[PDB]
Design a binder for this molecule. Structure first.
Ligand SMILES: CCCCCCCCCCCCCCCCCC(=O)OC[C@H](COP(=O)([O-])OCC(O)COP(=O)([O-])OC[C@@H](COC(=O)CCCCCCCCCCCCCCCCC)OC(=O)CCCCCCCCCCCCCCCCC)OC(=O)CCCCCCCCCCCCCCCCC
Ligand SMILES: CCCCCCCCCCCCCCCCCC(=O)OC[C@H](COP(=O)([O-])OCC(O)COP(=O)([O-])OC[C@@H](COC(=O)CCCCCCCCCCCCCCCCC)OC(=O)CCCCCCCCCCCCCCCCC)OC(=O)CCCCCCCCCCCCCCCCC
Ligand SMILES: CCCCCCCCCCCCCCCCCC(=O)OC[C@H](COP(=O)([O-])OCC(O)COP(=O)([O-])OC[C@@H](COC(=O)CCCCCCCCCCCCCCCCC)OC(=O)CCCCCCCCCCCCCCCCC)OC(=O)CCCCCCCCCCCCCCCCC
Ligand SMILES: CCCCCCCCCCCCCCCCCC(=O)OC[C@H](COP(=O)([O-])OCC(O)COP(=O)([O-])OC[C@@H](COC(=O)CCCCCCCCCCCCCCCCC)OC(=O)CCCCCCCCCCCCCCCCC)OC(=O)CCCCCCCCCCCCCCCCC
Ligand SMILES: CCCCCCCCCCCCCCCCCC(=O)OC[C@H](COP(=O)([O-])OCC(O)COP(=O)([O-])OC[C@@H](COC(=O)CCCCCCCCCCCCCCCCC)OC(=O)CCCCCCCCCCCCCCCCC)OC(=O)CCCCCCCCCCCCCCCCC
Ligand SMILES: CCCCCCCCCCCCCCCCCC(=O)OC[C@H](COP(=O)([O-])OCC[N+](C)(C)C)OC(=O)CCCCCCCCCCCCCCCCC
Ligand SMILES: CCCCCCCCCCCCCCCCCC(=O)OC[C@H](COP(=O)([O-])OCC[N+](C)(C)C)OC(=O)CCCCCCCCCCCCCCCCC
Lengths: 168, 177, 62, 136, 109, 86, 30, 102, 231, 51, 178, 67
C-alpha cells in the first residue's frame, strides 16, 4: 500500500501540467516529467519486487526476522536510492525538474517543489531504515554533494527567476 | 512464508553440526535461511522484540543523559566564571570540574555527531547505567508524573511502599568506616 | 559539432568540472580512512533501531 | 535485567550492571531463533487450556496446564541442546530458582509471555554461565 | 507433462478402450473388501480373488489414480472430522470479515 | 554497524581447532582418478616379484596429494586471520 | 617448447620430481 | 458493503448515469434503462461472487493433487546418479516401492 | 546446452556421485615399446592441454576470426556497397581465373577475419592475465567488458560511439555473468541436495531433521505471529 | 534447448526495435509495434516461467 | 521443495507463471479493446498518421478515454497495464532472473515513452469533428459509449478487483499438471 | 466488505504480495500445516504412548506440534 500510494501521485500531477499550464512548452515538459519520474518508479518497483518475492511478508515489520544477503542488500539499496532520487531531484537527474518548473503552472510548481519531491525522501527513509545495509554510503554521499555543488554553481547564470528557484 | 533468492556462487558449505556438505548455488530457501541470512543485525539479538525495543529506548535515553551531563558541566563552568573573578578561577577549575569536562569529551558523549559509534558491549553498558538510575529513582518512586504513568491505586501502593522503605532506611544504623 | 563541449570555454576548467564527482568521492574515501583509523562516524547505513521508525506508534488490537 | 545486586550496599537495594559474554549472547540468540515455535505454542496452549477448563465446574479443571508440560519440556530441551536432562524438572540447581520464577510468571500470575520469556532466558543464561564450554 | 501421471494415463493405444462399468464394479468390490479389512496400509494380498478381478477389469492408469485417491482419503480421515472441519470453516469465514493487524513488539523468535 | 555486532557462527579456526583433518576427507572424492591410479600402481608393484629399485609408488601419490592439497589449502588459508576474507 | 604438466616438472623445470611443489602456486592459490 | 446485489444495483445506476453523461444526453433519458441496468448488474455480480468462491474452493482442492505432482516431478527431475544418493535414496525407494501398490 | 561447462563444475559432488569429471587429465601416454609413428602421433594431447597459454590464445583468436567471418557473411558485406568499377574488375578476374570466387572471398573476408582474430586474442589475454583473480566476479566482468568494448567501438567502428560501446560492454558483462560464469539453465545438481559425512546413526539424522523442521516452521508468518484459528 | 533460442531472439528483437519504434509515422504502425512490444515482453515472461 | 525426514514441503505454486501470462494477455486485450472501441465510435478515415492523434481532441469523454487508454498501455501505475507489468516483474524476481528483469525494464521504459509521445500530438488547435453524420447530425453510439465506460471503469479500478481475476486464472491454470 | 469478505487481507495486497505461494497457504493455513505434519502427528502419538509406557524415544522428542 505504501508503494501504491507513492506511485499514485503521477496521474493527477501529469494531468495538471498537461491541461492547466498556459505555456506551449508545457506539453513537452509534461512528457519529460512523466518519463524521468517513471524510470525511478520502475527502479523502486524492482526493489519492491525483490523485497516481496524474497520475503512474502507485507506488514513492514516482519523484515526484522529476515536478513538479506550482501548482494541482495546492495542491489536493494542502489535501486531504492536511484529510484527515489529520480523523483527527489539528484544530479544528473534534474533536467526534468528544471523543464517542469519552467514550463508548468505557477500555482502547480509551488505544490511540486514543496511536497511532491519529499514523498520520495519519506519512502527512501522508510525502506533504508527497514532494510539492513552493509555497504559504504560514500558513493551516495558523493552523488548528493555533486548535485549540491552543480546547482549552486549554476545558480549564477540563470536570469529566469523560476529556473533560479528550481535550482535552489 | 519466507523464501529465498537463487544463488550463483559455486562455493562449498560445511555444516559440522548436522554433518553435511552443501553448495551455495544449490541451496533452497530453508537452507539459505539456515546458513546464509543468519547473521545478527542488532546490538542484542538475544533479546525479544519488546525487550530490544526497550533496549533501544534506554540506549537513546542514555545518550541523551550523557549529553545532559555535558550540558550540566558546561553550565556549571559558566556559573563558576560568573561568580568567581578571573583570579583563582583557573586554580579552582583545576579540580574535579576540569577532569569531568575532559572525561565528557566527544568519544564519551555524542554531542552533535550523527552517530555515537558504540560496540554492542558499550551499548549494553549504557543501557545498564540507565537501568541503574531507573532503579535508584524507582526505589523512592520519583517517576510518577515524569518518566512514568500509574493509576491512583498504583500511586497509593507506591506511596506506602516508599514510606516503609524510608522508615526502614532511617531506622538502619550508620555505616561503619 | 561533436566534442565542442570540451573545447568551448576553457579545457582545463571543463575537465575539472567533469572530474568534480570523482574528486568528491575520493575526498570522502580519505575522510573515511581517517574515520576508520580513529573510531568516529563512518559512512555507513547505521541500523541501531531494529526497524523501529522514529516515534512510531506500536500497538496491538484485541 | 542483566543487573547484579551490590552485596555491601549502604542502602537496602543497590544494583550494578554487567554485560553477558559474546558467546552467551550468540547462544541465546541462536536458541531463541531455533525454538521460537515452542514459546508461541506455550502461549497458544495456555490460552486454549484456560478456555477449555477455565470454569471450575469443568471436568478437566483438575488437570490444568498439564498438556502445556510437553511444550515446556520441549522448549527447555531445545534451548539447552537436549543436555542437562530431558525435562524442566531436571533443571540444575543454578537455574532452579529462575525456572520457578518463570513458572510463577506463566501459570500462576498469568503474566505476558513478554515477561515470562525473560525468566526462561534467565534460566538458559544461568545454565550457560555455569557450564561455559559444555554448551558453546 | 512428462512427469504428469494424469496425462500419461490419459494417453492410450489407438484401439484401446475402457469398460468403465466393469472396472468400477470390480474396484468397488475390492475397495469394500479393503475397507472391511480396515488396515493402515492397503494389503491387496488379503483379498486375492477381488484383487485379481480388479486387476483384470481396470487399467493400470485407473488403478494408479484409485490408489492415490485412496491414500489421500485415508490421510484426510486420519487428520480431520466432519464437525471439526465445519466449525473451522465457519470460524475462518467469520474471521475473514475482520482485519489482521500486525502484532508489534512480539515475544517469540 | 558491520563488525560492530556479535558473530552468529564460530568456525574451527575461530574456535582454535584444525579443520584440515576433515577437509582432507571432504576433498578426497574429487581426486578419484589419481587415487585409482595410485591404487593400481600399488597393486602392480605388490604383484611384481623382481621389481627394479627405481620403481616406486611415489609419483602417482605425489600427483594425488598435489591435487588434494590444491583444494584443501586455499579453503583453510582464506579462513585465517590476517588475510582479506574471501 | 611445450612442457608436459604431469611429469612432475613445472613449466619444464626438471628436478624436484619427488616433491609436492605445485600446491598453492600452480594448482591452488593460497 | 456486504450485499453483492445492492453493490451491483449501485454499480448499474452509476454506469447508466456515466453513460448518459458520456453521450451528452440528459440523465433522465430512457428512464426504463435504470432499473434494467440495476437488475442486470446485481444478478451478474452475484453470480460472479458465487463463481469466484467456487473457483477458489476448487483451486484449493486441485492444489492437493498438484502437490503430489510436485513431489513426483521433483524425484524424476533429479540428475543422473542423485536418485540413489543419501539425500534422495530413501524418498526414491518410498515412491518406487511403497507407492507401487497397484 | 551449457556455456563454459568445465569451469562451473562441482568436483566434490561429481566425485561423490561417481559422475565422470571434466577435470581429468585427458592425456596420452605412449609406451616405451611403441612404434616411432605411434610416439609421434601421441603428441596430439598437447592440442588438448588446457593450461597452454599460447594454445588458448590461438583458440580465442580462431573463435574471433570465425565470428568476424560470420558477421561479414551475414550483415557486413551485404550492407557495404562496393564501387561498380571494382565489382566489374573482380567479376572479370573471376571470368579470367579458375576459382576466382575463392580469392574474392579471401580478399573480402581478410579484414573481418583479421580484426576478429585480433579482438579474440587480445580479449582472452586481457581477461586471463587481468581480472582472473578479482574478488567481485560480477563487478570484474562488468568493468573489464565495459572498458574492452569501449576501446573496441572507438577503434573498429568509430571513436564517436565509445559511450555506446561502454554501455553495450556493461550489458554484455552482465549477460556473461548471468549465463556464462553462472549456471541458471545449466543446473547439474538438484536444489537442496547435499552429502552426508561422519558416522551418524539414522536415528540421530532423523532427530536433527525434526529439529530443522521445527525451526523451519517459524518461517511461516501465521505461526510466528500466532495468528492461526483453532482447528 | 528452447531457453537459449528464446533469450537470443528476445535480445535481438529488443535491440532491433528500440530504434525502429521511434521511426514510424502511422497509426497502423503504432498499433503493430505496440503488439510487437507486448509480444517481446510476453516472450521474456515465458523465459522466466520456463526457468 | 524441502525434505524433513522424507516429508516433502512445497511452498511454491508451480501453476502461477502461466496464470500471470494469461493475466497479461487478458489485460492487453482489454486495453486494446478499449482503444479500438474509442476509434470505432468515431470516423475511421481521419486517423492515418501519428499526427492525427490530434483528431481525438474531441469532447471530454473521447479525449480522456484516449488519454487514459494510452497511459494504461504505457504502464502508468494506477491503470490496468501496470498490474500486468508489475506482476510479471514480481514473478521474474520470484524466479530470480535479474537479467530478465533488467531487459524487461529497458523494454518497458522504451515502450512507455513510445506510447507517451503521442500525448504531445493529441494537443489540437481547435476541437476536431470526427463523428459520422447521420440524419444531418453526428452519430453517437450509446452502446459503444457504454462499453467504453465499462472498460474505463475496469481500467481505473482493476487493482481493487485483481485478486478475484488472479484467483480465477490460477484456478484455470491449476488443471494443467506442469 | 463484500469483495474482501473472503480474506482479512486487502485485495491489492492479496493480488501483489502473494507471489507463487499456494492458495491453500493463503487461505485456510491450518489445514495446510496439518496436511504437512500428517506423519509427524502419528509419530508424536506413538511417542506419547511410549512415554506413558516405560520406553522413552529420543528420536521423535522434538516433534511437539500445536498447529
Ligand atoms: C597529478 C599530480 C599533481 C600534483 C603535482 C603538482 C601539480 C601539477 C599539475 C599540472 C601543472 C602543469 C601542467 C598544466 C598545463 C596547463 C593545463 C592544460 O594542459 O590545459 C591546456 C591549457 C589550458 O587551455 P584552456 O584553459 O582551454 O584555455 C584558456 C585560455 O588561457 C584562456 O583563459 P582565460 O584567459 O579565460 O583564463 C582562464 C584561466 C584562469 O581560470 C580561472 O581563473 C578560473 C579557475 C581555474 C582553475 C585554477 C586552478 C585552481 C586549483 C586546482 C585544484 C585542482 C584539484 C583537483 C585535482 C587534483 C589532482 C591531483 O583558466 C585556467 O586556469 C587555464 C590555464 C590552465 C589550467 C590551470 C589551472 C589548473 C591546472 C591543473 C592543476 C592541478 C593541481 C593538482 C594538485 C592539487 C593540490 C593537491 O592550454 C594551453 O596550453 C594554453 C596555455 C594556458 C596557460 C598555461 C600555463 C602554463 C602551465 C604550465 C605548462 C607546462 C606544463 C609541463 C607539463 C609536464 C608534463 C607532465
Ligand atoms: C553439397 C551442396 C552443394 C553442392 C555444389 C553446388 C551445387 C548445388 C547448388 C545449390 C545450392 C546453393 C548454391 C548457391 C550458390 C551461391 C553462389 C555461388 O557461389 O555460386 C555461383 C557460382 C558462380 O556461377 P557462375 O557465374 O555461373 O560461374 C562463374 C564461374 O564459372 C564459376 O567458377 P568459379 O571457379 O569462379 O567458382 C567456383 C566456386 C565453387 O568452388 C569450387 O571451385 C569448388 C570448391 C571445393 C571445395 C574446396 C575446399 C577444400 C575441400 C576439402 C574437402 C575434404 C575435407 C576433409 C576433412 C578431413 C579432416 C580430418 O567457388 C566458390 O563457390 C567459392 C568457395 C569455394 C571454397 C569453399 C571453401 C570451404 C572450406 C573453407 C574453410 C575455412 C578455410 C580457412 C582458410 C584455410 C587456409 C589454409 O556458381 C558456380 O561456380 C557453380 C555453383 C557452385 C556452388 C558452390 C557453393 C559453395 C560450397 C563449396 C563446397 C563446400 C565444402 C565444405 C566442406 C569441406 C570443407 C573443407
Ligand atoms: C589500446 C590498447 C589495446 C590495443 C589492442 C590491440 C593490440 C595490437 C597488437 C600489439 C601492438 C604492439 C604495439 C605496436 C603499435 C600498435 C599501435 C599502432 O601502430 O598504432 C598506430 C600509431 C603508431 O604507428 P606509427 O605512427 O605508424 O608508428 C609506430 C611505430 O612503428 C611503433 O614501432 P616501434 O619500432 O617504435 O616499436 C613499438 C613498440 C612499443 O612498445 C610499447 O610501448 C608497447 C607496450 C606499452 C603499451 C601497453 C598497453 C597499454 C597499457 C595501459 C592501459 C591504460 C588503460 C587505462 C584505462 C582507464 C579507464 C578509462 O612496440 C613494438 O613494436 C613491440 C611489438 C612486439 C610484438 C607484440 C605482439 C602482439 C601480438 C598480437 C598482435 C595483434 C594483431 C591484430 C591487431 C589488429 C586487430 C585488433 O599508434 C597509434 O595510433 C596508437 C594510438 C594510441 C592512443 C592515443 C595515444 C595518445 C593520446 C593518449 C590517449 C590516452 C588514452 C588511454 C586509454 C583511455 C583512457 C580514458
Ligand atoms: C456519473 C458517475 C458518478 C460516480 C460517483 C462515484 C461512485 C463511484 C464510481 C462509479 C462509476 C461507475 C461507472 C464508471 C464511470 C467512470 C468511467 C467513465 O468513463 O465515466 C465517464 C463519465 C462521463 O464521461 P466524462 O465525465 O465526460 O469523461 C471524463 C473522463 O472520465 C475523465 O474523468 P476523470 O479524470 O474525473 O476520471 C477519474 C480520473 C482520476 O480519478 C481519481 O483519481 C479518483 C479519485 C478517487 C478518490 C479516492 C482516492 C483515494 C486514494 C487513497 C490511496 C489508496 C491506495 C490503495 C492502494 C492501491 C492503489 C489505489 O481517472 C481515474 O480514476 C484514474 C486514477 C485511478 C486511481 C485509483 C484510486 C483507487 C481508490 C479506491 C477507493 C478508495 C476508497 C477509500 C475509502 C473507503 C474505505 C472503506 O465520467 C463521469 O461522469 C466522471 C467519472 C469520473 C470518475 C468517477 C469516480 C471518482 C470518485 C470515486 C469515489 C469512490 C472511490 C473509488 C472506488 C469506486 C468503486 C470501485
Ligand atoms: C480486474 C480486471 C478485470 C477486467 C475486466 C474485463 C472486461 C470488462 C468489460 C466487459 C465486461 C462484460 C460487460 C457485459 C457484457 C457487455 C454487454 C452488456 O451487458 O451491456 C449491453 C447492455 C446494454 O443494454 P441497453 O443499453 O438497455 O440496450 C442495448 C441494446 O439496445 C440491446 O442489447 P442486445 O439486445 O443487442 O443485447 C442484450 C444482451 C447483450 O449481452 C451480450 O450479448 C453479452 C456480450 C458479451 C458476452 C461475453 C460475456 C462473458 C462474461 C464472463 C466473464 C468474462 C468477460 C470478458 C469480457 C471481455 C471479453 C473480450 O444483454 C445481456 O443479456 C447482457 C448480459 C451480460 C452478462 C453475460 C454473462 C455471461 C456469462 C458466461 C460465462 C459463465 C461462466 C461459466 C463457467 C464455466 C465453468 C465450467 O447492458 C446492459 O443491459 C447492462 C449495462 C450496465 C451493467 C453492465 C454490467 C456488466 C458487468 C460485468 C461483469 C464482468 C465480470 C466480473 C468482474 C471480473 C473482474 C473482477
Ligand atoms: C413494494 C415495492 C414498491 C415500489 C414502488 C416504486 C418505487 C419507485 C421509486 C422511484 C424513485 C425516482 C426518484 C427520482 C429522483 C429524481 C431527482 C431529480 O430530479 O434529479 C434530476 C437530475 C438532473 O437530470 P437532468 O439531466 O434533467 O438535469 C436537469 C438540470 N439541468 C437543467 C441543469 C440540466 O438527474 C437525476 O438524478 C435523474 C436520473 C437518475 C434517477 C435515478 C433513479 C433511481 C431509482 C432507484 C429505485 C430503487 C428501488 C429499489 C426497490 C427495491 C425493492 C426490494
Ligand atoms: C546495470 C548495472 C550497471 C552498472 C554500471 C557499472 C559501471 C561501469 C564503469 C566503468 C568505468 C570504466 C572502467 C574502469 C576499469 C578499472 C576498474 C578498477 O580499477 O577497479 C577494479 C577493482 C577490483 O575490485 P575487487 O573486485 O578487487 O574488489 C571489489 C570490492 N567490493 C567487493 C567492495 C566491491 O575495483 C576497484 O578497486 C574499484 C571498484 C569501483 C569502480 C571504480 C571505477 C573507477 C573508474 C575511473 C578510474 C580512473 C583512473 C585514474 C585516471 C583518472 C582521470 C585522470
Amino acid at each position: 500500500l505504501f508503494f501504491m500510494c507513492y506511485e499514485l501521485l503521477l496521474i493527477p500531477s501529469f494531468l495538471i501540467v498537461y491541461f492547466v499550464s498556459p505555456s506551449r512548452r508545457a506539453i513537452q515538459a509534461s512528457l519529460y516529467f512523466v518519463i524521468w519520474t517513471q524510470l525511478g518508479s520502475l527502479l523502486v518497483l524492482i526493489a519492491i519486487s525483490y523485497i516481496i518475492s524474497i520475503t512474502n511478508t507485507y506488514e513492514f515489520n516482519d523484515l526484522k526476522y529476515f536478513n538479506f544477503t550482501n548482494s541482495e542488500s546492495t542491489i536493494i539499496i542502489f535501486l531504492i536510492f536511484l529510484g527515489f532520487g529520480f523523483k527527489a531531484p539528484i544530479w544528473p537527474f534534474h533536467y526534468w525538474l528544471t523543464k517542469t518548473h519552467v514550463e508548468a503552472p505557477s500555482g502547480f510548481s509551488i505544490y511540486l517543489s514543496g511536497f511532491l519531491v519529499k514523498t520520495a525522501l519519506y519512502g527512501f527513509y522508510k525502506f533504508n531504515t527497514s532494510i539492513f545495509i552493509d555497504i559504504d554510503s560514500s558513493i551516495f554521499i558523493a552523488i548528493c554533494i555533486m548535485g549540491v555543488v552543480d546547482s549552486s554553481l549554476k545558480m549564477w547564470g540563470q536570469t529566469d527567476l523560476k529556473k533560479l528557484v528550481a535550482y535552489g | 512464508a519466507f523464501g529465498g533468492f537463487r544463488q550463483t556462487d559455486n562455493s562449498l558449505i560445511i555444516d559440522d553440526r548436522r554433518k553435511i556438505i552443501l553448495n551455495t548455488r544449490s541451496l533452497n530457501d530453508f537452507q539459505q535461511k539456515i546458513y546464509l541470512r543468519n547473521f545478527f543485525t542488532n546490538y542484542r539479538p538475544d533479546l525479544s522484540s519488546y525487550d530490544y525495543f526497550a533496549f533501544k529506548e534506554k540506549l537513546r535515553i542514555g545518550e541523551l543523559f550523557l549529553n545532559e551531563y555535558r550540558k550540566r558541566i558546561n553550565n556549571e563552568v559558566r556559573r563558576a566564571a560568573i561568580l568567581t573573578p578571573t583570579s583563582s578561577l583557573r586554580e579552582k577549575m583545576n579540580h574535579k570540574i576540569a577532569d569531568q569536562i575532559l572525561d565528557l569529551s566527544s568519544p564519551h558523549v555524542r554531542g552533535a555527531h550523527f552517530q555515537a559509534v558504540r560496540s554492542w558491549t558499550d551499548a549494553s553498558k549504557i543501557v545498564n547505567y540507565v537501568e541503574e538510575k531507573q532503579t535508584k529513582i524507582n526505589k523512592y518512586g520519583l517517576q510518577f508524573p515524569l518518566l512514568g504513568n500509574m493509576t491512583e491505586e498504583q500511586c497509593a501502593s507506591k506511596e506506602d511502599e516508599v514510606y516503609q522503605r524510608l522508615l526502614k532506611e532511617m531506622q538502619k544504623p550508620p555505616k561503619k568506616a | 559539432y561533436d566534442g565542442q563541449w570540451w573545447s568551448m570555454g576553457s579545457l582545463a576548467c571543463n575537465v575539472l568540472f567533469f572530474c568534480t564527482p570523482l574528486f568528491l568521492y575520493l575526498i570522502l574515501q580519505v575522510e573515511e580512512l581517517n574515520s576508520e583509523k580513529r573510531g568516529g562516524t563512518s559512512n555507513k547505513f547505521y541500523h541501531n533501531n531494529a526497524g523501529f521508525f522514529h516515534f512510531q506508534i506500536y500497538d496491538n488490537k484485541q | 535485567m542483566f543487573l547484579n545486586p551490590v552485596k555491601d550496599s549502604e542502602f537496602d537495594d543497590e544494583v550494578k550492571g554487567f554485560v553477558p559474554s559474546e558467546g552467551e549472547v550468540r547462544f541465546v540468540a541462536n536458541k531463541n531463533k531455533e525454538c521460537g515455535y515452542y514459546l508461541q505454542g506455550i502461549e497458544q496452549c495456555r490460552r486454549k487450556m484456560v478456555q477449555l477448563a477455565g470454569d471450575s465446574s469443568s471436568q478437566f479443571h483438575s488437570l490444568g496446564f498439564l498438556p502445556c508440560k510437553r511444550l515446556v519440556d520441549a522448549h527447555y530441551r531445545c534451548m539447552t541442546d537436549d543436555k542437562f536432562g530431558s525435562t524442566i524438572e531436571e533443571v540444575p540447581e543454578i537455574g532452579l530458582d529462575s525456572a520457578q520464577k518463570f513458572f510463577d510468571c506463566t501459570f500462576q500470575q498469568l503474566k505476558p509471555m513478554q515477561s515470562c520469556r525473560r525468566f526462561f532466558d534467565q534460566v538458559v543464561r544461568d545454565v550457560y554461565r555455569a557450564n561455559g564450554s559444555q554448551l558453546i | 507433462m512428462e512427469f504428469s501421471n494424469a496425462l500419461l494415463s490419459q494417453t492410450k493405444l489407438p484401439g484401446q478402450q475402457y469398460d468403465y462399468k466393469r472396472c468400477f464394479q470390480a474396484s468397488n468390490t475390492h475397495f469394500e473388501c479393503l475397507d472391511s479389512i480396515r488396515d493402515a496400509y492397503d494389503n491387496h494380498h488379503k483379498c486375492p480373488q477381488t484383487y485379481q478381478a480388479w486387476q483384470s477389469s481396470c487399467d493400470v492408469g485407473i488403478r494408479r489414480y484409485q490408489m492415490d485417491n485412496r491414500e489421500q482419503q485415508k490421510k484426510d480421515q486420519l487428520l480431520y472430522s466432519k464437525e471439526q472441519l465445519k466449525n473451522y470453516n465457519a470460524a475462518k469465514n467469520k474471521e475473514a470479515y475482520g482485519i489482521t493487524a500486525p502484532k508489534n513488539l512480539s515475544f517469540a523468535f | 554497524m558491520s563488525n560492530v555486532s556479535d558473530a552468529q557462527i564460530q568456525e574451527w579456526i575461530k574456535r582454535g581447532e584444525d579443520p584440515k583433518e576433515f577437509l582432507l576427507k571432504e576433498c578426497a572424492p574429487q581426486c578419484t582418478a589419481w587415487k585409482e591410479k595410485l591404487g593400481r600402481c600399488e597393486a602392480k608393484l605388490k604383484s611384481l616379484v623382481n621389481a627394479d629399485p627405481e620403481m616406486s609408488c611415489m609419483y602417482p601419490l605425489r600427483d594425488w596429494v598435489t591435487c588434494i592439497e590444491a583444494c584443501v589449502q586455499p579453503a583453510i588459508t582464506r579462513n585465517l586471520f590476517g588475510s582479506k576474507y574471501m | 617448447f611445450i612442457y608436459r604438466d604431469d611429469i612432475g616438472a613445472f613449466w619444464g623445470i626438471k628436478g624436484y620430481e619427488e616433491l609436492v611443489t605445485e600446491v598453492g602456486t600452480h594448482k591452488g592459490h593460497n | 458493503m456486504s450485499s453483492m446485489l445492492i453493490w451491483g444495483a449501485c454499480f448499474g445506476l452509476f454506469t447508466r448515469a456515466a453513460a448518459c453523461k458520456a453521450s451528452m444526453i440528459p440523465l433522465t433519458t430512457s428512464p426504463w434503462k435504470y432499473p434494467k441496468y440495476m437488475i442486470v448488474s446485481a444478478v451478474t455480480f452475484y453470480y460472479f461472487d458465487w463463481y469466484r468462491r467456487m473457483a477458489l474452493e476448487q483451486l484449493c482442492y486441485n492444489e492437493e493433487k498438484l502437490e503430489r505432482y510436485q513431489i513426483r516431478a521433483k524425484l524424476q527431475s533429479l540428475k543422473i546418479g542423485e536418485e540413489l544418493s543419501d539425500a534422495y535414496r530413501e524418498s526414491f525407494f518410498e515412491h518406487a516401492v511403497q507407492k507401487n501398490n497397484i | 546446452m551449457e556455456l563454459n561447462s568445465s569451469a562451473k563444475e562441482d568436483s566434490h559432488y561429481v566425485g561423490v556421485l561417481g559422475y565422470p569429471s571434466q577435470h581429468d587429465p585427458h592425456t596420452l601416454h605412449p609406451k616405451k615399446h611403441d612404434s616411432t609413428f605411434t610416439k609421434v602421433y601421441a603428441c596430439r594431447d598437447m592440442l588438448w592441454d588446457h593450461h597452454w597459454e599460447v594454445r588458448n590464445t590461438l583458440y580465442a583468436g580462431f573463435k574471433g576470426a570465425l565470428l568476424g567471418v560470420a558477421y561479414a557473411s551475414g550483415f557486413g558485406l551485404i550492407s557495404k556497397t562496393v564501387p561498380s568499377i571494382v565489382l566489374k574488375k573482380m567479376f572479370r578476374f573471376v571470368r579470367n581465373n579458375n576459382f576466382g570466387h575463392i580469392r574474392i572471398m579471401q580478399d573480402l573476408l581478410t579484414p573481418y577475419a583479421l580484426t576478429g582474430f585480433g579482438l579474440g586474442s587480445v580479449y582472452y589475454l586481457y581477461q586471463h592475465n587481468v581480472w582472473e583473480n578479482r574478488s567481485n566476479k560480477w563487478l570484474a566482468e562488468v568493468l573489464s567488458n565495459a572498458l574492452f568494448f569501449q576501446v573496441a567501438t572507438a577503434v573498429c567502428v568509430n571513436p564517436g560511439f565509445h559511450i555506446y560501446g561502454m554501455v553495450g560492454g556493461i550489458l554484455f558483462g552482465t549477460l556473461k555473468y548471468a549465463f556464462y560464469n553462472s549456471s541458471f539453465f545449466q543446473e547439474k545438481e538438484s536444489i537442496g541436495s547435499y552429502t552426508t559425512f561422519g558416522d551418524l546413526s539414522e536415528e540421530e539424522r532423523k532427530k536433527q531433521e525434526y529439529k530443522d523442521y521445527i525451526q523451519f516452521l517459524g518461517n511461516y508468518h501465521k505461526v510466528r505471529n500466532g495468528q492461526l484459528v483453532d482447528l | 534447448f528452447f531457453w537459449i533460442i528464446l533469450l537470443i531472439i528476445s535480445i535481438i528483437g529488443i535491440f532491433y526495435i528500440i530504434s525502429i519504434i521511434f521511426d514510424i509515422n502511422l497509426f497502423k504502425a503504432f498499433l503493430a509495434y505496440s503488439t510487437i512490444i507486448n509480444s517481446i515482453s510476453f516472450i521474456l515472461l515465458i523465459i522466466a516461467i520456463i526457468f | 521443495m524441502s525434505i524433513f525426514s522424507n516429508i516433502w514441503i512445497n511452498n511454491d505454486l508451480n501453476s502461477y507463471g502461466l496464470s500471470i501470462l494469461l493475466l497479461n494477455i487478458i489485460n492487453y486485450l482489454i486495453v486494446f479493446m478499449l482503444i479500438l472501441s474509442v476509434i470505432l465510435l468515431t470516423n475511421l478515415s481521419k486517423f492515418k498518421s501519428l499526427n492525427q492523434f490530434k483528431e481525438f481532441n474531441s469532447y471530454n469523454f473521447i479525449l480522456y478515454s484516449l488519454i487514459f487508454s494510452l497511459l494504461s498501455m504505457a504502464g502508468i501505475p494506477p491503470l490496468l497495464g501496470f498490474t500486468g507489468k508489475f506482476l510479471a516483474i514480481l514473478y521474474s524476481s520470484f524466479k530470480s532472473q535479474y537479467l530478465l528483469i533488467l531487459f524487461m525494464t529497458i523494454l518497458n521504459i522504451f515502450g512507455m515513452y513510445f506510447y507517451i509521445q503521442n500525448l504531445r500530438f493529441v494537443v489540437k488547435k481547435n476541437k476536431s469533428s470526427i463523428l459520422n453524420y447521420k440524419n444531418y447530425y453526428v452519430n453517437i453510439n450509446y452502446s459503444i459509449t457504454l462499453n467504453i465506460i465499462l472498460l474505463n471503469f475496469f481500467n481505473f479500478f482493476g487493482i481493487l478487483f485483481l485478486s478475484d481475476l488472479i484467483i480465477i486464472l490460477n484456478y484455470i491454470s491449476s488443471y494443467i499438471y506442469i | 466488505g463484500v469483495w474482501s469478505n473472503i480474506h482479512p487481507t486487502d485485495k491489492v495486497t492479496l493480488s501483489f504480495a502473494n507471489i507463487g505461494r499456494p492458495f491453500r497457504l493463503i487461505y485456510r493455513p491450518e489445514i495446510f500445516l496439518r496436511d504437512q505434519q500428517a506423519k509427524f502427528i502419528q509419530l508424536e502419538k506413538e511417542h506419547i504412548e511410549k512415554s506413558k509406557k516405560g520406553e522413552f524415544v529420543e528420536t521423535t522428542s522434538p516433534l511437539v506440534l500445536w498447529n
